[PDB]
Structure 1
């Protein structure tokens, strides 16, 4: 079914964001794992899988709407060198992605692509859950101190 060209461009742009998050969250995960921060590896890896699911949804949607998914262009990764920097970087990435999502959702509505909108709203809901987790972790680092925070990561939950 021929979709609206601009919806397709938004979908490719969102896909682009997901491709960046997939890689950044995957590397961050295995960095945590290497450091023995098991709990962080589990969450971060499952966050990477989640973005893969999102990418898959965009790819299928783009294809259905008869556009060309773009997996060739990869935006800037921002890989941190310590736990806090890594988490802040993920947070900034999510915030930028939410921004793009809000714009796309608004536009899809005004061209009546309600199923693209509906798919994007579920994704935004998942992203806000991830933003919440990131914000909470960053606050915990500050409230309990880094040493205690790190110790709390060495065993998986539960």
Structure 2
């Protein structure tokens, strides 16, 4: 079914955001794992999986609308070197992606692509959940101190 060209453009932009996040979350997860911070590996691994699911949804939607999914161009990663930097980088990436989602959701409505919009609202709900987790962890580091926070990560849940 031939979709709106700019809708497809937004879907490719959002897919691009998810592709950066998949890689950034996955590497962060395995850095945490290497450091013995098992609980952080578990959560970040699951966030990477969540973003893969989102990417799959964008890819399938673009193909249905007869566009070409772009998996070639990869945006800038910001890995970081310690726990706080890594979490802040993930939060910043999530915030940027949420801005793009809001723009795309408004546009899809204006051209009556309500199914693409509905998909994007569900994804935005998921991303706000990631944002809530990241903000919460960052605040916990400040409240209990980094040493107590690290100790809390060494055994799974």
Q: Secondary structure at the match of 2:72?
A: coil
Q: Secondary structure at the match of 2:154?
A: coil
Q: Deviations over 1:94-145 (max 9, x none)?
A: 0000000000000000000000000000000000000000000000000000
TM-score of the aligned structures, taking structure 2 as reference length: 1.00
Q: How far off is 1:49 after superposition?
A: 0.2
TM-score of the aligned structures, taking structure 1 as reference length: 0.99
Matches of 1:130 and 1:152, distance apart in 2: 20
Matches of 1:80 and 1:36, distance apart in 2: 17
Gaps of 5+ in 1: none
Q: Which residue of 2 aligns with 1:35?
A: 35
Q: Could you list the structure 1 runs, at least 4 aligned residues long, displaced by more than 2 angstroms after superposition.
A: none
Q: CA RMSD in A?
A: 0.2
Matches of 1:97 and 1:53, distance apart in 2: 15
Gaps of 5+ in 2: none
Q: Which residue of 1 aligns with 2:86?
A: 86
Q: Deviations over 1:37-68 (max 9, x none)?
A: 00000000000000000000000000000000
Q: How far off is 1:81 after superposition?
A: 0.2
